[PDB]
């Protein structure tokens, strides 16, 4: 547990292992900080000062981002019957005086966050870096629209807030490289997609003109490209070609041939491209990540080789491993570390250490050990640190804790009003579970809240139990059953302890890693909806009124989806989700073609679909196939290389 | 172009290249024929006699298979108002006298086809190989049903006909190995799938008991596992959780979390397993194919090495290459073939040829050359054989022929009754197209009807044109309209020729390969429907009547799907197709739960789904990802490897 304020004493001995820390967890530092400048030079202090306020910044980034539900409609005041809810949302819309407060607080942190790299980049460099120049200008745009409501065309604030939220996060920008690096391949294949629509849209207009079909549905040619596009999605499958089938039965041979080519041949081949084009772009990000590693190791190799000859004595590099605080006794480990990499140079047995050799060294060590084990810095003035047989024992606990609920809920079909003997069993079970995590700080380590992936995900849920049980009878109702389903992620911990089964073993570790790995790649799509909603709120604001007469003819009134409606922002975010899932997405396309009365409404849903069935095929479906083959072959090699490494 | 009747002269010199032919196109021969027995022993004659009647057999296998639409309903005669059509099909159902004519002729070929391996396998061997023991017994079951004609429980004929059709074809059996070799992995993951239905079905029953939701939809717990299964398919997405959403808006955060786990995380991970389990089973079929190759080369290496020492002089193997009819200037490249394929042994420069070395020889030759070029052998007594500048030229030919069609159809929106100057342009264009294939027999070769993949697919449509134009004015109406509509495979010939474009190069080189590669793997699924139809015809025969009162309440009458009906066989095959595509598949599950009045109807559609979303994820979607990476890397390698392949 060495220091982190460590590139500021900055010895050749000392400042190495901070750089060696920077390879293992792999955080970047700026190329301005990578070239020169130290914590003695009062710039690298501000680098680690930035990472102190990181949780301050991400608290702001979602604070800015979640304003978009809470801000009002595009047209509250032009609209009549404004305060009523004619199928509007739930949220309170913030008043204009309240609107200012939540933004001025928001902007001032951005003005810190955007101009904090002045403290460790030069102003003639900071304004040159051409990534900030986007982000700086986005701040100015909010600074305008705050001033407009301070002074009190269509208020283009919320599009920018997304773009601020996309770029600021390191993960979403790293996602966003994989779009623009690959988007030349997707729009490429979008043509040959559109070709086998237009050709196959045409033949149905050719074949079915004089029959009942062209009389009924396929009136225009443009009626077909409209319809046959929906059948490319197959979310309207038999309703299209009933009167083609009802007239002649042999007309089915067309449509069942079309969808086969449509779904089963093309849409997979769209996925075949995008998953294949993913691999090249992912390789460019990985190699772009690994060039960061060697370029940071070049600063590390130059920090030691002060003779500047490119060869370092071994005792010069052995001695820093205790300062590395990696392993405890070091008599002959580095002699073993020669054969662990491919070849020994052995021109001198110890004296010659080449540039690429040490770059292989620090990269190798953290894989085998994971022994750095660094906790957070504590004050010793309190000193609060208190100084599968058990696995099969805790296999039994979450069994009987689970069946306690199903007994409680088969009491609820009996509807016991006398829960007095059953409330004896209620409060006791939450008191139990805090004891099975207790041996871990007795056996191995204290700060493993951030270590086990279960403690990454259950740590709220582990501690939320008895604090919910506390205000049960001391509050002397709706929040009472709020716990009564919350006491069920016990099975989710029972999942992982059942997930030691070797029969499920590859499928286990993917779905574990599937939550952290696909958090940016689903995070970007959540930002994409925040674009499409804020378009559609402004396009379709007060459109579905209370008494709109074009409404009740259409499909939203037939199937009674007279909710989601786009009539403000959080109503829109649900509505784009159904268009994401493709559950009956042609209702809205059929509805807003009538509620706007125009065919330029069809633009909004197709432009969703193309970018969606890029992004669903891009980052959902192509990752899982990459993520499984990561988790599969490790299990396939851990037995085989465990025969080697032992 | 030597003979094929060639292992019956059966020289050590001669009968080699017939075995060398058997490696190149790779047909199997039986292990009885592989062990011993020759065309002198007459058994090898019956082997090639079998492959003469191959097209006779596949003409029978679809003849037997297509009786199942043409055979009648399960209950014509118990049903009242039998001859009327109350949402029944189109086909004429075969009369019982005319039925047996189509069956006795069918069976007599099977009795040839099943007992033809008597002629080249011993009877104590033929009844031992346990493929036949299935297949012979299936013949007996049909032989029963012909006796049932003279008598005039539920007539289980048509299930067997599929099983006969599956096993007889070599491709579908090779598909069917990949099921049973992998089905232990799929049902393995089906349980862990079923768990994250049940648990996620459970919480929605837990959450929504006291609210409006459990009052309205989620009445039973079994009501939820019913509903939440449909939302795993998302073919009923907002209709489920409207009254959960209409009451509390926060209930959406459940459902949008469920489908993400449901579709985007699980269903890909089901596809991740099945595509990964595909690779191992496909490797077993490939290695099972390649063991056939070396074991056939062992008979070839033993045919030459008559000294039985395992080493063959090169002039013994040089001399047969002219009998192979492979290449013209032989002795200059046979020394280069030492250097091209692999490394030379060079203990003797030519004298020593090992067992595995010759196995490397004949394997590599057919790749580089393709110079065997075997035609269909003619009688010379008639002697009917008559003894990209052009590519950019025939690029232009279809274009002006294509725009002639769209001019003809924009005449039809004008509706010209005077087609007399326009019929000058009609008949002339079909006469043109037979001339662009004509240089191929002048430049390169005659029998390339089976060689170019375009001539594999266009050859019916290439020649159908002028014979459709012939009976236009000499018949002095509805049929010649469709021929006017048929004038469109020209752009389908443009599809192949245009993808010399490197921008689209890999994509349709897949799609070319995609039709023959996925012909068995879609063929099996077509057989799977012929199982599920013949179940559902017998289960649901006269159910959707004319005046059924339970019918008009349900969804098939609401959305007017009163076709797609199950009330005979070909209504079923359309109907299972919609359940295959997943276009509104919950209508039938909602309908036949009412029209049978029972909950055991739900079995039929779920058991469809699990086997289907095996087989769609199995053999559609896993192939295209395998097939693209076959087509992609060959384009990626040949540009670099052609500098080495030279
Ligand atoms: C893939 C997405 C990962 C990111 C997770 C989303 C974080 C943002 C959370 C949104 C919370 C809004 C809840 C709204 C209810 C409330 O109680 O306030 C409410 C809005 C309905 C649900 C909103 C979620 C829609 C977007 C999620 C799905 C898209 C992501 C792909 C109604 C307001 C009320 O009356 O209380
Ligand atoms: C992949 C999967 C498959 C599915 C199947 C379905 C269908 C298709 C085929 C495609 C290719 C493979 C089919 C065929 C055809 C159709 C049609 C139907 C109708 C009937 C009508 C009759 C009269 O005429 O009336 C299948 C379905 C069925 C079959 C049938 C055949 C024949 C027909 C006619 O006849 O038309
Ligand atoms: C593969 C391309 C085939 C056809 C694609 C081009 C067709 C473009 C427009 C077709 C004509 C529309 C017919 C009605 C228009 C009108 O009468 O004004
Ligand atoms: C990418 C291919 C298609 C994308 C979107 C499909 C929209 C094409 C359908 C045409 C709209 C209706 C035709 C206009 C006829 C009219 O206005 O009278
Ligand atoms: C962004 C590019 C996509 C282009 C969108 C579709 C291109 C063609 C538009 C379809 C209109 C054809 C309708 C003509 C027939 C008619 O109006 O009567
Ligand atoms: C984050 C980049 C945004 C991408 C495109 C945003 C702006 C495109 C269209 C904006 C408003 C379009 C609506 C026009 C019709 C109307 O306002 O009534
Ligand atoms: C990929 C971008 C999607 C392309 C959107 C297609 C737009 C076509 C809209 C209908 C076409 C007919 C235009 C006439 C407009 C009108 O009738 O008012
Ligand atoms: C994240 C980038 C997405 C931007 C692309 C979506 C914008 C395309 C169309 C938006 C609405 C256009 C149709 C509105 C017509 C109208 O004004 O009535
Ligand atoms: C992960 C599992 C959670 C629960 C799964 C087991 C539930 C099986 C049946 C639940 C009880 C059904 C309630 C009504 C039955 C009745 O009273 O007849
Ligand atoms: C593979 C998981 C589910 C598969 C099929 C889902 C069927 C479960 C739904 C239960 C049916 C209705 C409940 C019975 C109650 C009753 O008899 O009224
Ligand atoms: C082939 C195995 C699949 C098993 C099919 C589903 C297993 C459970 C069946 C659901 C019935 C539960 C309904 C109980 C509640 C009630 O009826 O009141
Ligand atoms: C090819 C193998 C067939 C697989 C299973 C076939 C037989 C299973 C069920 C057959 C009939 C089931 C219908 C029972 C109810 C009824 O006949 O009324
Ligand atoms: C994988 C196989 C599919 C499993 C099929 C689930 C069958 C459940 C059917 C409903 C369960 C309730 C049984 C009561 C029958 C009845 O109400 O008549
Ligand atoms: C190719 C193999 C598929 C066989 C599996 C399908 C058979 C499962 C259920 C068939 C029908 C069962 C439900 C009928 C109930 C009834 O008799 O009313
Ligand atoms: Ca040195
Ligand atoms: Ca050494
Ligand atoms: Ca309806
Ligand atoms: Ca020899
Ligand atoms: Ca030699």
UniProtKB/Swiss-Prot annotation, chains A, B:
Residues 292-327, 333-368 form the EF-hand domain. It comes from Arabidopsis thaliana (Mouse-ear cress). Residues 216-230, 569-583 dip into the membrane without crossing it. The chain crosses the membrane at residues 51-71, 100-120, 138-152, 153-169, 189-209, 253-273, 388-407, 424-444, 457-476, 482-499, 511-531, 605-625. Disulfide bonds: none annotated. It is a multi-pass membrane protein. It is found in: Vacuole membrane. Pfam families: Ion_trans (PF00520). Residues 639-646 have a biased composition (Basic and acidic residues). This is Two pore calcium channel protein 1. GO terms for cellular component: cytosol; Golgi apparatus; monoatomic ion channel complex; plant-type vacuole; plasma membrane; vacuolar membrane; vacuole. Inhibited by Al(3+). Each of the two internal repeats contains five hydrophobic transmembrane segments (S1, S2, S3, S5, S6) and one positively charged transmembrane segment (S4). S4 segments probably represent the voltage-sensor and are characterized by a series of positively charged amino acids. InterPro entries: EF-hand-dom_pair, EF_hand_dom, Ion_trans_dom, TPC1_plant, Volt_channel_dom_sf. Residues 1-50, 121-137, 170-188, 274-387, 445-456, 500-510 are cytoplasmic. GO terms for biological process: calcium ion transport; calcium-mediated signaling; regulation of jasmonic acid biosynthetic process; regulation of stomatal movement; seed germination. Functions as a voltage-gated inward-rectifying Ca(2+) channel (VDCC) across the vacuole membrane. Is one of the essential components of the slow vacuolar (SV) channel. Acts as the major ROS-responsive Ca(2+) channel and is the possible target of Al-dependent inhibition. Involved in the regulation of germination and stomatal movement. Disruption phenotype: Plants display an impairment of both the Ca(2+) inhibition of stomatal guard cell opening and abscisic acid (ABA) inhibition of seed germination. Belongs to the calcium channel alpha-1 subunit (TC 1.A.1.11) family. Two pore calcium channel subfamily. It comes from the Eukaryota. Its main location: membrane.
